[PDB]
Design a protein around this ligand. Structure first.
Ligand SMILES: [Zn+2]
Ligand SMILES: [Zn+2]
Length: 52
C-alpha cells in the first residue's frame, strides 16, 4: 500500500487503507485536516466517484 498524495508507503501506522479498494492515504497528507485514524469506514476519492 502507497499514499495517493505523496506516493510513499512509510509510517504505516499513519496510513489509512480504503474500505472500497486497495488504495491508501497518510492522515497527515489528507486535506481537510485529519488528526487521527477514524473509527468507522473510510473511502478514497476514486471510490467516492462511484457512489450514487
Ligand atoms: Zn502521504
Ligand atoms: Zn478506494
Amino acid at each position: 500500500v502507497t499514499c495517493l498524495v505523496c506516493r510513499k508507503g512509510d509510517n504505516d501506522e499513519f496510513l489509512l487503507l480504503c474500505d472500497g479498494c486497495d488504495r491508501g492515504c497518510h492522515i497527515y497528507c489528507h486535506r481537510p485536516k485529519m488528526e487521527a485514524v477514524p473509527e468507522g469506514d473510510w473511502f478514497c476519492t476514486v471510490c467516492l466517484a462511484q457512489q450514487v
